[model samples]
Target: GSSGSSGSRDIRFANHETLQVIYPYTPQNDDELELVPGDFIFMSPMEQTSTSEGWIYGTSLTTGCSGLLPENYITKADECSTWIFHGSSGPSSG
Candidate 1:
């Protein structure tokens, strides 16, 4: 059996999933990532095994940064869906 080595598709990385930022989140530390409304990026498998609960890892496509992201900060949406962000009680609020 031979596995394909070269290919191109929406799946940038195997097992990676696309996520949309629904809230504006600021990092509490340097290793953490930030997010704003409607931003899309790829989530890493490290999320499930994160040291802390309610947090995950994602790479920012807008700024090209990878770090810890709030799990609840991102949600699934259509590839061409419209997002409206106008809420309160974000991750920044202690």
Candidate 2:
């Protein structure tokens, strides 16, 4: 998922990289929430994943969820080190 480049910036430590997100619908209380494949969740770099909480994507993000992800996080070319979020407008490092 992480890669590095020789340009102004690198992704993870390789030349090219690709990331993919898969969102699946899980049975909640009564209804099914739509989880788009691109949806994602993350925590602040300073936040602690062991004790602190993290964000949720795809289906409705609930609280108290913490741990490693089951799949890749991002997917893009190495053209740029900074990636833009659609709705949040926040920039993420490739």
Candidate 3:
């Protein structure tokens, strides 16, 4: 488990979900990543502020920077299974 400055905790890298940026955004906090439209970043829900309206706690796998981002700035990308199951048609037939 990982702990945060606000006593927030998360499972070890469990939140592998991604978000596709629909708009450009700059990080207000030093811990956050500067984002541009079309950038895909790994987003995690943290206990501290995951439910905050118009905001979410997220981190970028590319830069390892973590903080809050505008909820409307990104759209939930395709699930991990969609990425993991690439290059196949039918499971049994292949």
Best by TM-score: 1
lDDT of 1: 0.71
How would you encode candidate 3's per-residue C-alpha lDDT over 1-94 as one tens digit per residue?
7445542344343645678778978766654457767667665545336436667666655565667777778888754454475676775853
Q: Any runs in candidate 3 off by more than 4 Å, and if so which? A: 1-15, 47-51, 79-94
TM-score of model 1 (CA atoms): 0.61
Ranking by lDDT: 1, 3, 2
User: How high is the lDDT of residue 66 in model 3?
Assistant: 67
For each candidate, the alpha-carbon lDDT, in order, equals 0.71, 0.34, 0.63
TM-scores for the candidates: 0.61, 0.22, 0.55
**Which whole-number lDDT from 0 to 100 does residue 1 have in model 3?**
70
Deviating ranges (above 4 Å) for candidate 1 = 1-13, 46-52, 80-94
**How would you encode candidate 2's per-residue C-alpha lDDT over 24-81 as one tens digit per residue?**
4443432222333654333223322332232222212333243333333333323334
Ranking by TM-score: 1, 3, 2
Better of 1 and 3 by TM-score: 1
In candidate 1, what are the lDDT values of residues 1-94, reduced to their tens digit? 7566643244544767778998989788867888978788677564444625777777777887778888788886457532575445578941
CA error at residue 38 for candidate 3, angstroms: 2.7
